[PDB]
Amino acid sequence: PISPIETVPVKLKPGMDGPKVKQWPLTEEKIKALVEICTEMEKEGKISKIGPENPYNTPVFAIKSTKWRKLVDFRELNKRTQDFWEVQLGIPHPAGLKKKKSVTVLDVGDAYFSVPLDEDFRKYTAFTIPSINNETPGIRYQYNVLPQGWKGSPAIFQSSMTKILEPFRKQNPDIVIYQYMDDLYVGSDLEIGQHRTKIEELRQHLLRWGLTTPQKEPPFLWMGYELHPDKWTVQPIVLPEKDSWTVNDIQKLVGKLNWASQIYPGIKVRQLCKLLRGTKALTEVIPLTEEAELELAENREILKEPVHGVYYDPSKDLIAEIQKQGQGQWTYQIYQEPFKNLKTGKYARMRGAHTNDVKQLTEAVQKITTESIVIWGKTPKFKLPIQKETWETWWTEYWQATWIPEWEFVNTPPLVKLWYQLEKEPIVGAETFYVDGAANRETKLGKAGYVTNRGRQKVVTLTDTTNQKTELQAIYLALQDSGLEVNIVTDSQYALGIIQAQPDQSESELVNQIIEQLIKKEKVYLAWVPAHKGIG
Amino acid sequence: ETVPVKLKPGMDGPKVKQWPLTEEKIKALVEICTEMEKEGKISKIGPENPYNTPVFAIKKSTKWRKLVDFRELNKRTQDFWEVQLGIPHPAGLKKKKSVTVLDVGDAYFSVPLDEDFRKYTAFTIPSINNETPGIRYQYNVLPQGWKGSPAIFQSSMTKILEPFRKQNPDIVIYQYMDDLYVGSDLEIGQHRTKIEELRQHLLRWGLTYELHPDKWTVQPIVLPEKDSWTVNDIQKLVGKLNWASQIYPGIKVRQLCKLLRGTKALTEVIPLTEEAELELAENREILKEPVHGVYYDPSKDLIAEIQKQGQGQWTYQIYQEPFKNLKTGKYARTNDVKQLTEAVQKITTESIVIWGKTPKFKLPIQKETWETWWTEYWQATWIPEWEFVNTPPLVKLWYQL
Numbered sequence: 004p005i006s007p008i009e010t011v012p013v014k015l016k017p018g019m020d021g022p023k024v025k026q027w028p029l030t031e032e033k034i035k036a037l038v039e040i041c042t043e044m045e046k047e048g049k050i051s052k053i054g055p056e057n058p059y060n061t062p063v064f065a066i067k068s069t070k071w072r073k074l075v076d077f078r079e080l081n082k083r084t085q086d087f088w089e090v091q092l093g094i095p096h097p098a099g100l101k102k103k104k105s106v107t108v109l110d111v112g113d114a115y116f117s118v119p120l121d122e123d124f125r126k127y128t129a130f131t132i133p134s135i136n137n138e139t140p141g142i143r144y145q146y147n148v149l150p151q152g153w154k155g156s157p158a159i160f161q162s163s164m165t166k167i168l169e170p171f172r173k174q175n176p177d178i179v180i181y182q183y184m185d186d187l188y189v190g191s192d193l194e195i196g197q198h199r200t201k202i203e204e205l206r207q208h209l210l211r212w213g214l215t216t217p218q219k220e221p222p223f224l225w226m227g228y229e230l231h232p233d234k235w236t237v238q239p240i241v242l243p244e245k246d247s248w249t250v251n252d253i254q255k256l257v258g259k260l261n262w263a264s265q266i267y268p269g270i271k272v273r274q275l276c277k278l279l280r281g282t283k284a285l286t287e288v289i290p291l292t293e294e295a296e297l298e299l300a301e302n303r304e305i306l307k308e309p310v311h312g313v314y315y316d317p318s319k320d321l322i323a324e325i326q327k328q329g330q331g332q333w334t335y336q337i338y339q340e341p342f343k344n345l346k347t348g349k350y351a352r353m354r355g356a357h358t359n360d361v362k363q364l365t366e367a368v369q370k371i372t373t374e375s376i377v378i379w380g381k382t383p384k385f386k387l388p389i390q391k392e393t394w395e396t397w398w399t400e401y402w403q404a405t406w407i408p409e410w411e412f413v414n415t416p417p418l419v420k421l422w423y424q425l426e427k428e429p430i431v432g433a434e435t436f437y438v439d440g441a442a443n444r445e446t447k448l449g450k451a452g453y454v455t456n457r458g459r460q461k462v463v464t465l466t467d468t469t470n471q472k473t474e475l476q477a478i479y480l481a482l483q484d485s486g487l488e489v490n491i492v493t494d495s496q497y498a499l500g501i502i503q504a505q506p507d508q509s510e511s512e513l514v515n516q517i518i519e520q521l522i523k524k525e526k527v528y529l530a531w532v533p534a535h536k537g538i539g
Numbered sequence: 540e541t542v543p544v545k546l547k548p549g550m551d552g553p554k555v556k557q558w559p560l561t562e563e564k565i566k567a568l569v570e571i572c573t574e575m576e577k578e579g580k581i582s583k584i585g586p587e588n589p590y591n592t593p594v595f596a597i598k599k600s601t602k603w604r605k606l607v608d609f610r611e612l613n614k615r616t617q618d619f620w621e622v623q624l625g626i627p628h629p630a631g632l633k634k635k636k637s638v639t640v641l642d643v644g645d646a647y648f649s650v651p652l653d654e655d656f657r658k659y660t661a662f663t664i665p666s667i668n669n670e671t672p673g674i675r676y677q678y679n680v681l682p683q684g685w686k687g688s689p690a691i692f693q694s695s696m697t698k699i700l701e702p703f704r705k706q707n708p709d710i711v712i713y714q715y716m717d718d719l720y721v722g723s724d725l726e727i728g729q730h731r732t733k734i735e736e737l738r739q740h741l742l743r744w745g746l747t748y749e750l751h752p753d754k755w756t757v758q759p760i761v762l763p764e765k766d767s768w769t770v771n772d773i774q775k776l777v778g779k780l781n782w783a784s785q786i787y788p789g790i791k792v793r794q795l796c797k798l799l800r801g802t803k804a805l806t807e808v809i810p811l812t813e814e815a816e817l818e819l820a821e822n823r824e825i826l827k828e829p830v831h832g833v834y835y836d837p838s839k840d841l842i843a844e845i846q847k848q849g850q851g852q853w854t855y856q857i858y859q860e861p862f863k864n865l866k867t868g869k870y871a872r873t874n875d876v877k878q879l880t881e882a883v884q885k886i887t888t889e890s891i892v893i894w895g896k897t898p899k900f901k902l903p904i905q906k907e908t909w910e911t912w913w914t915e916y917w918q919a920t921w922i923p924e925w926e927f928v929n930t931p932p933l934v935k936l937w938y939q940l
């Protein structure tokens with residue numbers, strides 16, 4: 004059938020005219036196939052024979068079981084067609100779904116061909132079955148329905164389907180219908196009997212609108228998930244056992260672990276991912292480092308027992324728990340009743356060159372907060388491995404604003420803590436180092452040194468360096484040579500910036516070494532002075 | 540009747556992503572939009588409209604109110620509302636003792652939007668977990684938040700205010716987006732009475748917050764009051780003066796870098812030499828006046844920088860070219876994001892009153908954090924431009940009070 008629904012109006016891009024691609028010549032069998040197909044389509048009203056008045060064309064062809072298919076190549080019409088709203092701005096997450104008694108999938112048969120095209124547009128869909136060796140006038144058709152491979156078809160179909168479902172939805176609030184391409188997933192809390200009845204009424208309603216439909220039973224494979232009516236999990240994950248790992252094997256392995264990490268707690272991929280780093284051939288063999296091999300083993304153990312997630316009960320709070328796995332790796336679980344996870348996840352991204360665990364935890368929390376609002380429309384209650392005192396110490400002193408929803412301390416080591424503090428005031432009875440660092444732009448040479456109030460003085464030389472590096476070196480110098488307590492005067496806003504953020508991890512080894520020092524100290528006061536103003 | 544609205548040359552309408560909303564606000568927006576559709580202000584639309592501007596709910600007091608983020612549409616229509624129909628800004632507004640802010644957004648909803656512009660005002664009500672495709676609408680009437688609306692309504696607004704303006708010649712009434720700013724020098728009592736009279740005029744036409752600009756006086760950068768000066772204290776002094784001289788013509792620092800020579804212990808106490816406390820005191824007096832040589836340029840964008848001080852106080856500067864400060868200030872007392880949000884609204888309000896323009900904000904906060912939370916505390920009908928920045932903590936210790 005062809006839905007009795009209103010059509011969606013459609014226009015070419017401003018300025019643009021309909022396509023006019025010349026039909027290439029087809030072999031006789033291809034020509035024969037298309038003629039039979041277009042005759043059948045014509046009979047059902049899918050297409051219409053058209054006159055020589057219609058100046059637009061798009062190349063059609065035919066491909067090979069010994070069934071033939073008509074491929075209309077819409078490259079040109081597509082790039083001359085208007086933009087449409089996006090079909091889906093997002094995909095539901097199973098963890099967001101509410102538990103259901105019974106669930107049914109109906110697939111719409113011949114979806115696009117069952118929806119009418121805007122009459123004012125059909126002309127641009129004109130195509131031409133060539134004659135043998137292209138000697139006579141082709142046979143010319145235009146579409147009456149949504150063409151396969153045309154730009155506007157996914158959207159107009161989905162809109163048409165939505166428009167159609169609206170009545171049934173309104174007359175059936177307690178029923179859940181999810182539109183995905185040309186499937187409908189239908190869920191309810193009815194007992195099977197009244198359910199299969201509601202399902203028949205839905206069909207009958209679809210039929211009155213030009214949409215035929217079957218029936219598959221659970222579990223449903225969809226978007227890499229496996230959906231049951233009371234639990235969900237990811238598609239079956241099989242980790243290859245092999246002696247040699249190519250870049251492409253490792254990529255696919257990281258992809259499967261990342262996907263599995265939605266519901267299998269504590270999946271790790273840092274060490275696997277380190278292998279990928281570098282310029283590297285798809286086919287190139289990468290021997291697994293020991294840590295990578297340890298990672299593979301742990302995930303291997305994690306993945307043995309099948310794990311499923313529960314569905315969402317909107318009458319209950321969401322609890323989100325985060326744990327540090329180390330090396331900037333964080334893992335989390337989200338449950339409403341301990342410990343029946345709706346979902347799990349991980350966070351590992353480095354934001355900046357230098358951070359500490361408090362900053363990282365806060366980012367993890369932020370990522371989880373956003374994700375919860377999408378999936379459940381509310382934020383979770385957090386259980387974090389950090390003392391309230393630690394956290395409020397840091398974020399009141401820090402210059403960035405922050406705010407994380409309701410949370411509370413949970414004792415799950417490693418705990419997150421600041422590993423040093425910088426003094427608020429000059430320290431009395433400790434050496435003041437006036438440090439200084441600089442690099443000749445022309446030669447890469449650099450001197451880094453200091454002068455103290457106790458007459459100590461030292462100057463090293465560095466090679467292939469930069470002002471930034473030499474200023475860090477000078478601060479590092481003063482930390483090595485000084486006692487457990489020390490004041491340090493630098494003109495580098497740059498080094499000052501980095502160190503005042505109490506980094507505990509960094510991409511620069513200099514900065515890691517400086518971090519070594521700072522943790523070892525008992526008191527450090529850092530002061531900045533304007534450069535060249537002849538201060539000390 | 541409808542006024543012809545055409546976008547910028549060769550530029551398309553907005554296509555801005557809807558930031559995720561919580562369930563309570565999605566609900567509020569459905570409630571609100573079902574009513575406006577019923578009343579014909581907006582209509583459902585089909586997939587053949589590719590445009591989309593963000594929408595959110597605020598409270599502004601437990602009535603949910605719909606806030607459309609037209610920042611992109613405004614950029615792309617700026618010829619229309621700035622040049623073809625620009626509302627002039629009165630310089631006397633900032634001079635009144637009392638400026639009252641009245642919301643007149645309800646006015647626009649009685650005027651039809653040019654049939655051919657409507658598609659550019661499309662917005663989406665998304666669903667939780669994307670279980671059901673977003674609810675899509677476009678406007679049929681001048682929408683709140685689009686700078687086009689007051690530009691178009693300008694003709695009717697002056698008809699409405701004509702009687703009241705004639706009868707009170709010393710009241711300045713200025714319109715910026717959905718609000719009226721009304722300024723007088725009256726006693727606060729008489730001022731309030733006059734606002735009430737103004738409501739009645741508005742009330743007859745379908746149009747059913749108190750500032751004191753005079754008191755607005757710059758926060759002068761401030762130099763420590765002491766008798767005892769360590770090396771550290773003077774170091775911090777030179778640092779704060781050094782930076783000030785970037786802005787203030789005639790800031791001198793040498794008689795102080797005088798005492799700061801030699802590698803002396805940080806804690807060491809140092810006598811304030813004669814010249815030193817002289818050069819110092821002279822700088823104090825310069826720091827009290829406005830910057831010589833800095834002038835608002837109407838063609839240039841305003842920038843606002845904010846720093847978290849501590850303890851619930853924030854400093855800010857408004858400029859067009861870095862270090863050429865047009866204004867500096869502070870803000871009072873909970874939650875970091877709440878306070879930032881409040882400070883941004885105060886600064887924007889002052890900015891509108893002074894220049895008839897809102898600043899682009901450099902905000903010291905992680906993007907997703909601002910994004911997640913700002914509408915929990917947003918009260919205004921407009922939204923300034925903003926961006927997210929990593930504050931030099933030296934910049935901030937120069938602005939303590």
Ligand SMILES: COc1cc(F)c(C(=O)c2ccnc(Nc3ccc(C#N)cc3)n2)c(F)c1
Binds near residue numbers: 095669
């Ligand atoms: C992609 O399949 C679907 C099927 C659906 F209905 C939806 C829903 O819109 C939806 C809404 C509320 N509860 C459930 N609960 C629910 C649905 C299906 C099963 C199963 N099996 C279990 C629970 N699903 C969806 F977003 C995706």
